[PDB]
């Protein structure tokens, strides 16, 4: 049976996501215009925007406030790119293997991601991830839970209070496991939890590749000028 507390957690996550995720993408206009490292100014801004939205989602997660701010900081810094990649799935379209944001100018393709400082080494595995995640055909409830579980990870380096961070994660993971069983019908249900957890593992690797690529881009001072200060603080550290 799905419990009242667990139903509460799903309602909170779904609403927090609606508040932090606009399917219109209206704000995209605020970003520096994309050029088709022509993309980098535009895409750095989108990531900087995405970071802010991820933070707003993270605050809403039940039990996240209980954590020390330092622990809040460590989780967000390490998970930010991963959550942004998970969130992106919503815009990502199988039809063209690209992220569609509503307009041609805001529609993003491997060349565009390449256009702004990223190797295929990152991009080829990332596109595979979006395809595999899309295949899962997750309920919005599942997608929101995965993002939350990803943010609250006990193992992230620098974590002070893993015991608390695991206890918060466990409640979210139990809610997801119970939700799949109670509200997810076979066959889609089949091995659905384990597959979602595998996606978290794929994220870690994607995150690591991003770190090394960002650092290479970061090392050149001129390229670093293109980025936002919030991007420099989080991914730059």
């Amino acid at each position: 049976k799905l419990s009242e507390e667990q139903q509460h957690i799903i309602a909170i996550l779904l609403d927090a996501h609606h508040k932090t995720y606009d399917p219109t993408y209206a704000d995209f206009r605020d970003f520096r215009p994309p050029v088709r490292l022509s993309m980098l100014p535009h895409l750095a801004d989108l990531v900087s925007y995405s970071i802010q939205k991820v933070i707003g989602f993270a605050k809403m997660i039940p039990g996240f406030r209980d954590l020390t701010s330092d622990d809040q900081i460590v989780l967000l810094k390490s998970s930010a790119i991963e959550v942004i990649m998970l969130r992106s799935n919503q815009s990502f379209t199988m039809d063209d293997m690209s992220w569609d944001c509503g307009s041609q100018d805001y529609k993003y393709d491997v060349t565009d991601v390449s256009k702004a400082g990223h190797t295929l080494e990152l991009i080829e595995p990332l596109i595979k991830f979006q395809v595999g995640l899309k295949k899962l055909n997750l309920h919005e409830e599942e997608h929101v839970l995965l993002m939350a579980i990803c943010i609250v990870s006990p193992d992230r380096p620098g974590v002070q209070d893993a015991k608390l961070v695991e206890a918060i994660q466990d409640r979210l993971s139990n809610t997801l496991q119970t939700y799949i069983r109670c509200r997810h019908p076979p066959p889609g249900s089949h091995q659905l939890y384990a597959k979602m957890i595998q996606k978290l593992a794929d994220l870690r690797s994607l995150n690591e590749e991003h770190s090394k690529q960002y650092r290479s881009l970061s090392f050149q001072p001129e390229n670093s000028m293109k980025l936002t200060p919030l991007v420099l603080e989080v991914f730059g550290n």
Binding site: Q52, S69, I73, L76, L230, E233, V234
Partner: peptide, 11 residues
Amino acid sequence: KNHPMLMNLLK
């Protein structure tokens, strides 16, 4: 530690 903007958004 040296995360001024991220800390402010977290508040």
